[PDB]
């Protein structure tokens, strides 16, 4: 178990090694990011289908990217998606050990487009701290908006 950083960034500026984006059975990063990547970086637009609760890295050669799947909460039950956001932590969390990286920006998925209506980043944090405490790394959470660098700073120092 590291430390957390939290950076107001975009994606298509991730240049922390690696990065993980949505990506789902259809190989798309849902929401509006798609397009930012694609403007700096078409060669991560794999977007080829996915299985469901596998993330696959994607081999740009403008810079390797990981897709994940995040199940869409939306219509699926809560067994359903608890399983598949441990299965896509595990593929990442077991590709983080196995690439043996010190430190990976991670964005926060779940939280509107996927979720629905209830599911937040509170939560998938939760989630990601735990997967990501199996590692004595960093994590590092990006989002353009900043109220989530305010709130992930206030958590990030009632965690101590």
Same mark, same amino acid.
């Given at each position: 178990?590291?430390?957390?950083?939290?950076?107001?960034?975009?994606?298509?500026?991730?240049?922390?090694?690696?990065?993980?984006?949505?990506?789902?059975?259809?190989?798309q990063?849902g929401?509006?990011?798609?397009?930012?990547?694609?403007?700096? +970086?078409?060669?991560? +637009?794999?977007?080829?289908?996915?299985?469901?609760?596998?993330?696959?890295?994607?081999?740009?050669?403008?810079?390797?990217?990981?897709?994940?799947?995040?199940?869409? +909460?939306?219509?699926?039950?809560?067994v359903?998606g #608890?399983?598949?956001?441990?299965?896509?932590?595990?593929?990442?969390?077991?590709?983080?050990?196995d690439?043996?990286?010190?430190?990976?920006?991670?964005?926060?998925?779940?939280?509107?487009? +996927?979720?629905?209506?209830?599911?937040?980043?509170?939560?998938?944090?939760?989630?990601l701290?735990?997967?990501?405490?199996?590692?004595?790394? #960093?994590?590092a959470?990006?989002?353009? #908006?900043?109220?989530?660098?305010?709130?992930?700073?206030?958590?990030?120092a009632?965690r101590?």
């Amino acid at each position: 178990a590291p430390s957390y950083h939290v950076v107001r960034g975009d994606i298509a500026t991730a240049t922390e090694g690696v990065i993980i984006n949505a990506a789902n059975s259809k190989g798309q990063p849902g929401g509006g990011v798609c397009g930012a990547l694609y403007k700096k +970086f078409p060669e991560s +637009f794999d977007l080829q289908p996915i299985e469901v609760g596998k993330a696959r890295l994607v081999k740009g050669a403008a810079k390797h990217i990981i897709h994940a799947v995040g199940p869409n +909460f939306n219509k699926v039950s809560e067994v359903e998606g #608890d399983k598949q956001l441990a299965e896509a932590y595990e593929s990442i969390a077991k590709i983080v050990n196995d690439n043996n990286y010190k430190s990976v920006a991670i964005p926060l998925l779940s939280t509107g487009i +996927f979720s629905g209506n209830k599911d937040r980043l509170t939560q998938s944090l939760n989630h990601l701290l735990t997967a990501l405490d199996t590692t004595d790394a #960093d994590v590092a959470i990006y989002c353009r #908006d900043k109220k989530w660098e305010m709130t992930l700073k206030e958590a990030v120092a009632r965690r101590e």
